[PDB]
């Protein structure tokens, strides 16, 4: 199967597969069962921000999710990415809905990756920034029900004409160019991702979440990965 590392913004507690009893943020290393989570006071209808950082010196992946004028949720996990991901990968955003729904709208997404090999300061870096998505976003790989164009935003999951979220929906958005996430001779390798979301739920009972993920270059949506699987894993082991 695919190899997946992701930071998930879980909105429905499926405490049957290890989920906490409330909306949380977690770090997933090749499994939907998070290695570590943290209560997240999700505010329906409000724009929020997610910051993800990681450097090869500390080998620690951390994420911060906040809402203007509110306390923020923070989660970290000491993990060495060299022994988990191939050196070339793709980065993206995945979201899903099932019995219950919510809108998984992305308003902006920026990413920056730095790699410094031991021929020093000789630095290779990739940086892209999206403040608005056009109907035909060629530098993006849309999968499932994911669409752009809806005037500026990126709708990861199905939303009706009138604007309401649909159930049982899965969508992803991967950046076209592959990314060099780590390299043996690297003195220092780091990357940071930022995106603003708007999870809206008419019936105050959202589900299932949005996630920032890293995977093998040819990863695609697994079958039946709607709902609780956030369109990243085939099962819940």
């Amino acid at each position: 199967a695919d190899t997946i590392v992701a930071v998930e913004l879980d909105t429905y507690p499926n405490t049957d597969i290890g989920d906490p009893s409330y909306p949380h943020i977690g770090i997933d290393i090749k499994s939907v069962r998070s290695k570590k989570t943290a209560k997240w006071n999700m505010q329906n209808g409000k724009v929020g921000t997610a910051h993800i950082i990681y450097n090869s010196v500390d080998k620690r992946l951390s994420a911060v999710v906040s809402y203007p004028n509110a306390d923020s949720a923070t989660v970290s996990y000491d993990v060495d990415l060299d022994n988990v991901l191939p050196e070339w990968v793709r980065v993206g955003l995945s979201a899903s809905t099932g019995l219950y729904k919510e809108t998984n709208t992305i308003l902006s997404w920026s990413f920056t990756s730095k790699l410094k090999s031991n021929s020093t300061h000789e630095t290779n870096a990739l940086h892209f920034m999206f403040n608005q998505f056009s109907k035909d976003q060629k530098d993006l790989i849309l999968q499932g029900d994911a669409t752009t164009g809806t005037d500026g935003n990126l709708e990861l999951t199905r939303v009706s004409s009138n604007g309401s979220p649909q159930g049982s929906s899965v969508g992803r958005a991967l950046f076209y160019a592959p990314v060099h996430i780590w390299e043996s001779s690297a003195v220092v390798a780091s990357f940071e991702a930022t995106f603003t979301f708007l999870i809206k739920s008419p019936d105050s009972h959202p589900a299932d979440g949005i996630a920032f993920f890293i995977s093998n270059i040819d990863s695609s949506i697994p079958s039946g990965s709607t709902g609780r699987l956030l369109g990243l894993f085939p099962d819940a082991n």
Binding site: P23, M42, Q43, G45, S201, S204
Partner: peptide
């Protein structure tokens, strides 16, 4: 005022 599920 748009903010809460739980």
């Amino acid at each position: 005022m748009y903010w809460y599920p739980y």
